[PDB]
Paper text:
One specific mechanism used by nairoviruses is the production of a deubiquitinating enzyme, termed the vOTU, that disrupts the innate immune response. Interestingly, the nairoviral L segment also encodes a viral homologue of the ovarian tumor protease (OTU) at the N-terminus. Instead, the vOTU’s primary function appears to be the reversal of post-translational modifications by ubiquitin (Ub) and the Ub-like protein interferon stimulated gene product 15 (ISG15). Each vOTU possesses a seven-stranded beta sheet as the core feature, with five major alpha helices framing the rest of the structure.
The vOTUs from DGKV, QYBV, and TAGV readily crystallized and were solved to 1.62 Å, 1.65 Å, and 2.05 Å, respectively. These vOTUs represent diverse nairovirus species, and possess extensive variation in Ub activity with the DGKV, QYBV, and TAGV vOTUs possessing low, medium, and high activity towards Ub-AMC, respectively. In QYBV vOTU, Trp72 packs with Pro85. Additionally, it is in proximity to His79, suggesting potential stacking of the rings. In contrast, for QYBV vOTU there do not appear to be any direct interactions with the selectivity helix. Instead, Lys109 and Ser108 form electrostatic interactions with Asp15 and Asn16, respectively, suggesting a role in manipulating the positioning of the β1-β1a loop. Specifically, direct interactions, or the lack thereof, work in conjunction with the other interactions to complete the structural features. This is most notable in QYBV vOTU, in which Phe14 appears to pack with Pro76. In contrast, the DGKV and QYBV vOTUs possess more polar residues, including asparagine, glutamate, and threonine for DGKV and glutamine and lysine in QYBV. Despite being phylogenetically distant from CCHFV and the other robust vOTU DUBs, QYBV demonstrates substantial Ub activity and possesses Ile130 that could pack with Ub’s Leu8. Further, increasing the hydrophobicity of the pocket in QYBV vOTU was able to enhance Ub-AMC cleavage, boosting activity by 150% and 50% for the Q19V and Q128A mutants, respectively.
Author numbering: 2 to 156
Amino acid sequence: NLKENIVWEHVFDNCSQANVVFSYREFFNKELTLPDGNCFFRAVSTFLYDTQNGWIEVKNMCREFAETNWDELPGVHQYFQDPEHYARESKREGYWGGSVEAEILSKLLKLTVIFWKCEDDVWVTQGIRWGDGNYLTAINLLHIQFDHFDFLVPI
């Protein structure tokens, strides 16, 4: 029961986490992303544009929100000194998206972002969430081994 039986526990700022056990195919259809280091941005691109091909625009909008709204990003502050530092690192070859950008996008887009942990391509066992919504009002990502992210579309 994804709408009522989840015990989300505060982590930090707008981030919470939970043990939540379900076969993801009962609630979602999975859309694969290219297995490169841009997979997080590819998954969000699929949500925004119906194609993973716009992943650079997602990286761009994260950098821009860091510049215009730096004060609202305490999670980002744990890892980056200022917006210019974030822009420098996120443009680098080999940068991998994740929790930093989940915070940024939840606040830029004003919706919830959820990472659903799944290690056997069937069963989710944990969630981590930025924002206060449930999965129907969220960007849902399947978070599998080696920090690969695929996109999940609610049924």
